[PDB]
């Protein structure tokens, strides 16, 4: 059986540790999908639509480290681009492979199906270059190994996604086989010496862990530096779970005036803040109100540290933090005697109407060290950041891209990447409507994801930035949807919870559904949301609206 | 009270004839949506997601002439771009407007939500320029009139979509008000004389009507020319319904070896073919096998005619066709003796298992002159092109872009644009799962769309180009979905038809459902499809696979 | 004195070893040029126009390793882009820095001078992304270190050029200071083991050295492998000088039917060819006639080797060649008893009309181990590739980009990068007309470049692909131009040579001009060119013209 270009790609994807890749068929990729099916270290997973395909691969990469999605030219890839730009924003090496016109059509002027109807077939690549770290087109088998290895090696080095298109008559063409793997003292001393003087010369220091720290591979080194300093540690909201909440120095999330108790003063009252790989965007800074920077910040990024008025280039954040931790003095003033303060809401009477605080209390009680909680944009961001996490629990947030509906397909991909964990999904009713059909794929693969669907009858987070008729949604019977997707062949279970007692019974049933997803539709009033959402929403709306010049 | 940049856009959109625009809210567009709401000539319609928002605008433009969709930066617009590229492919002036960063963030290096996380806000405009005829960004109210009028005037002139983004703090900023409207004889003589010579020198001439003729506004002039020539007239598959099927010269669709009976010889056996605004792509030419071109073809395009070895530029197709029809000789040889042959499927025994031919027969019987039949990519293309159309019936096909799932939001937008017509949607089960949630918006607006969902358990069209496990889909209870979307406040109705008797009884219940959509889930075997799909699919596949 | 963004860039450019950078002033870069003037490890050099500016930096990088050019927005940068795409094509890390609009104009709709007159100021960056490996815009000083270090570190790693624009009011803004520096066994064993089996299983092997081998840093390792194998070694034309011509295995250039004697048979008659970092384009393959590839080629590239039907990724060409050389058996059949054969033209009678072969004989006799010979596109490519090189002599060719006129500004930049060497420039009269004014800069800096200007009254190389009235040029008094550029303040010398005796006397005078350039205008008939030009020109023209499908 002749070895082909598509096999070359399949074998490299398996080699970088994918166990699955995601696809939607179209004639320009069918031979490629057949070549990928020959690799039996991976399962080929089919998605309902390409936007869902792309966010399933994004969710898979959060657990696995990388992922791949394969789509057809133009009508598949342009939807997958929203999710690919999402992977770029969230520092995940997703490889999007699109099927593409037969190479013999290049140079002809032939107009081809799925294109704009002009002689141009390069617009899709051109568009992809704006949202990836590498983008290549294979029209000849002899070029395929260099292009495949370039796109995979660059994506994995940068932790950013990349794009590959393969002419449809070349996916099955003969190719060579893959071999090998796609899977500075003075500078470091100067940077470490400056960071040690920054700590030593201050009376108090607090660490603030940012949401690029996973992409830097530096989470364990952050803990070593926290152990050595004994300082208060806080996380930015989008870094929820990236630092252990049972560490004796952890004091919660820093998010300006919506911080955990004590955390705003820990960061803003300290003589120096050590910021590890942050994303200071308008939402994270609460409309530019909460943004530690400048001479009293040691800004540590994946290949540079800026401290004491100097940017030290050429140093790896991991080696830096390890050396700094081995030599620093202790600065424990912002931690001593303090603790991380989490909500302590008393249980509601079981028959009272369900409210947000009761629902969040029951969800937080479900978390284990083995839980992965995917939380959608909406008030679920604020309920998730408020949860006290058992050590080992993972929270996945998409706070820089913020595409509502990401969470459904992302929970499906994560559940396939990490089947040993307990997957829990918190998604609002508005977000659910964009990508709901990927629950039918959860059902198809008997994945036991527990989904809390928060039915507050519209886009409550927008109701709290700026209200209007556009925040209303058509209501669905969300719980009844599960039987519709099972269609007599599936173990999906849909339950409704209108009280704390109904929610607790629904949760018991969900935990007992071992071979399919359970959706629990939790009914809340439209204005029953976290206080933090309202305080943040005000500040961020005022920032968006601020008047020209 | 103070007139704003978003009211200037709203008023221009109303001025070009929109009665609706489509939107998905996000913080970058809310002020803009509040300004659009002030125009009471339009209704603002909310969509489940942005791919569906864009394709509802595309289906609305097919009936209305134009459309607009409003989305938020990046997370909204990048999915709407698939639909915008689809409006370019299908020659429809959809205007996509996206909300965008506050103008005071430009020049700062601020990182913003919904972006790539870099200091770049211009990637979205840059991407949009590849799929539109005009693309502008407003960051200052002083510029907004020239940029709104350039995108709308260019889109309407070119019959192609356009892109506008408006900084979120500028949509509510004061603006001037809109006034005025956004809504060669020697060359024509030379072209008409060469075309007259082309016809007079030939004994058998046939017309082939192409799917860019509606973008040219030349459908009535094509009828005038067919009346003068008396010749056979055929339509390309994607031009279904663009020429009237009761015309005495109509001889059905030309589609190479899957043509209506006699139509392949009408075109391929003629001494000349008059080709009106065709798209000869790989699917239309049946893998490059069926492609009339060259010295024996008069190729008539929007602004140019190529005939007799010369390309005549600067002539409007409408004026050309009217002058040619007024002077031409008659050439009726290709019509003599012939007729349009359409399927004559006998009615099945009512309790026999449903098959595709029976389902197609009953859907064909439902069509009227006031029907719009939206037909999805899949075997529904072949069942639609085979339908005998009453004069005036409209069929909508998306055969150049061909994005499965387009039909659901496109039928929703066409139902809002043309509420006086009877809307019928044929959609396959695989396609329905990409965009199904827009049926909930049909229910929200009480639109009486009758939807035939063909449940043959997978992607049968693909099963016929090249089969594999990727053609299987997770089955749904499609009928039972209607009550889920009603959620106690809607008039959607879901029915199942497993026999011709059950299908006839479901169609009569669907016709009686006047205030909400009815989905009839028709069960067919995977391999029970038209013969034309099988024949077309193998040619088309062989062309895709041809070796380096 | 406050440290600024422009200083940050100046100090990083000095740190990567530039001794000069090239500039043309415009109001959008004047404050930046003032910040660069503060670094006294570099000289700021002014160019006549931006295309010349960009090719002076390209020539400088060939000697130095890297280079920088600074230009004004749009009217400067778009000309510099031709030279930047040239640097990409020739694998040289040139950094182009453009001055750019004031940051406060972004977001205003202001129309600005030097732009297209629309509200768009991003088109220049967008265009630059197609011809560089990194492209960034600085509009805020706090972003400047990351963007500067990203563009320099990426350019130096990739050996490709990069682009940076800096808002004009930010070049002088305060900035932090620069610290630190911008300056796999199993895979390697598998690749080496396969390459050793490739050699061992064959009776004869020949090495073919390609013009990407400098960018790979692998020239010394190629010599070690040639020493170990004892095989015939040949160079592709564009690799002239990248392998030592006095090595006992060297047998000249392989260039199909225009190869050195014996070299075509060495490569095409061998059982296996080891190809080191080649560029097989239409000119190198002589119109696709001479292109060793496939199962009998070991293709060695900077990070991959393809041999024995496998592409081994993840291995550095230098480590690979060193390990291969340490273990290979000898395969000397294609070298034994052979020698590199070079032209042996007898000296012309001194008073006979000068002809090409006599001119090339005198130029070849001028070369020393310390010579850098820059040779322009035209018949000078074929005269240069025919020269026998003393060990250490460098030849610079621009055979992939092939922009006529490159050679003038490239010889000026090289002469500044490497003033310890003897610089010689061979440029035809047509090419000279595109960029002649950079000889006035050679004069301004007293650079003793000897220029042979071949005046054959038009574009003789095109006359031999396809003749027409477009191959004629307006003749100039090239030798008289030198006094015009000196304008009473310069040591440029212009001489004419119409015979071999006049050329020899002119050369003596040139060698004696120690403080300025000498141009010797050599008069040749239009059809007096190398035989190789005519044979190559035919083949490459036939390839260009070959008929649609
Ligand atoms: C693709 C996309 N379109 C629009 C938005 C704007 N958006 C941000 S939050 C949100 C509503 C989320 O509503 P829901 O999921 O019901 O969450 P709630 O706040 O009610 O819990 C919207 C429309 C977005 N973020 N992404
Ligand atoms: C967005 C998109 N992705 C993938 C494709 C490839 N595609 C062409 S037809 C088809 C299947 C259509 O299946 P169905 O709607 O069930 O129609 P059938 O042929 O079964 O009646 C596919 C997947 C496409 N055209 N568009
Ligand atoms: C910028 C640019 N424009 C046009 C060309 C096409 N070109 C290739 S060689 C050449 C003529 C070179 O003439 P000359 O320098 O007189 O060299 P000769 O062959 O006569 O020695 C031309 C015009 C090119 N290579 N670069
Ligand atoms: Mg909600
Ligand atoms: Mg189907
Ligand atoms: Mg010349």
Numbering used by the authors:
A (entry chain B), C (entry chain B): 1 to 183, 191 to 556
B (entry chain A): 1 to 183, 191 to 555
Article sentences:
Pyruvate decarboxylase (PDC, EC 4.1.1.1) is the enzyme responsible for the non-oxidative decarboxylation of pyruvate to acetaldehyde and carbon dioxide. All characterized PDCs are dependent on the cofactors thiamine diphosphate (ThDP) and Mg2+. The quaternary structure of GdPDC is a homo-tetramer best described as a dimer of dimers as for ZmPDC and ApPDC.
GdPDC crystallized in the monoclinic space group C2 with cell dimensions: a = 129.1 Å, b =141.0 Å, c = 91.1 Å, β = 125.8°, with two monomers per asymmetric unit. The refined crystal structure contains two identical chains of 544 amino acids (residues 2–180, 191–555), each binding a ThDP cofactor and a Mg2+ ion. As for other PDCs, each protein monomer may be thought of consisting of three distinct structural domains: the pyrimidine binding (PYR, residues 1–186), the regulatory (R, 187–349) and the pyrophosphate binding (PP, 350–558) domains. The tetramer is generated by applying a crystallographic 2-fold symmetry to the non-crystallographic dimer in the asymmetric unit. As for ZmPDC, degradation of the cofactor presumably occurs after crystallization; Figure 3B. The linker connecting the R- and PYR-domains of GdPDC (residues 184–191) is not defined in the electron density of both symmetrically independent monomers implying it to be highly disordered. Interestingly this seven-residue linker contains three proline residues which likely add rigidity to the region. In GdPDC this loop is shorter by four amino acids, foregoing all the described stabilizing interactions, possibly contributing to the lower thermal stability of this protein. The lower thermostability of GdPDC is presumably due to the smaller number of hydrogen bonds and salt bridges between monomers compared to the enzymes from Z. mobilis and A. pasteurianus.
